[PDB]
Design a protein around this ligand. Sequence first.
Ligand SMILES: [Cl-]
Ligand SMILES: [Cl-]
Lengths: 187, 187
Amino acid sequence: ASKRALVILAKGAEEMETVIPVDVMRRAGIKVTVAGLAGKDPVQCSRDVVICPDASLEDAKKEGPYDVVVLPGGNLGAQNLSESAAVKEILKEQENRKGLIAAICAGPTALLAHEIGFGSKVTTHPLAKDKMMNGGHYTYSENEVEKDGLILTSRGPGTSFKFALAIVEALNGKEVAAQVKAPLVLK
Amino acid sequence: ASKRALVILAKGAEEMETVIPVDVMRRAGIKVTVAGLAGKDPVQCSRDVVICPDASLEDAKKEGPYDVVVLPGGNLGAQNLSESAAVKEILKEQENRKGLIAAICAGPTALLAHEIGFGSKVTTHPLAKDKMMNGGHYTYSENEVEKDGLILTSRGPGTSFKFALAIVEALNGKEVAAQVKAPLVLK
Ligand SMILES: [Cl-]
Ligand SMILES: [Cl-]
């Protein structure tokens, strides 16, 4: 069966960090569900791009499990993810079943909020480092993409392609990732 | 006054090539209007991301002129742009008033369809070269971004950041482009 990805989309999400992974994962033949944190309604992203989610998170979370749960960044988006009990439950379940969790920019700070993957090497946007490192529960990395087992993190809009291709490689292998990469006109 | 950009959004547009320039231009303090070719309704992009335009093209075209007109790629999106009489009128007017026209991936093939900027050096997605070069009306480039006066072209999803920053540099200058670039985590 095809792999499945849940992308959790909150108000104030960075739209580039949402769309790049969604699009690249779909190019890889992954079934992606863009799930709205607040419900089924369109979501106003950080730079005012408005995206219509495929489903509410309430509905999508009942259609698990997923091979990856993806958390976009954006400062306000990540704060919304961090404050959500539903996100907490989803991430804890994903961690418990040894499934991949991928987060970019400010996204990884939601891992901290929900006590996910402590002891991992992680990266974040430079401006989100202090929040992520509060308490020293992770070890910090400046790599564009960091993968420590099932915790996959990345830095910012500009590292979104590498982040998305890392998810593809983790799920579908190096060859598929290379096949998907070539038509993107990268490197 | 702030610069103004018109981004024309058609069904089958490449969502990455739509969102990256919109977001980066807004980071640069440009007033961007995402205008739906077909009207006010949400637009199903090439990888099924659904974007709600700010306005219909019918309405937005009456609120010109714009400092840049931006054509995203996506094979089917670009075909829709190429077939549109409204797009023809907008591009001809922009060309006539010596305003910037920016197109990426398959997007530049709409310049060919509407007989815009003949004699320019252009680039496109590798797979769109043959369509763009039909008749030899342009000279082809393999640069990630090509700017020949007021015709600014680029290659693919992976060159979208360079494309968007080139638009910012053209409108608001090198220093603003560098300021906007740094937080994106590029290079
Ligand atoms: Cl942000
Ligand atoms: Cl396409």
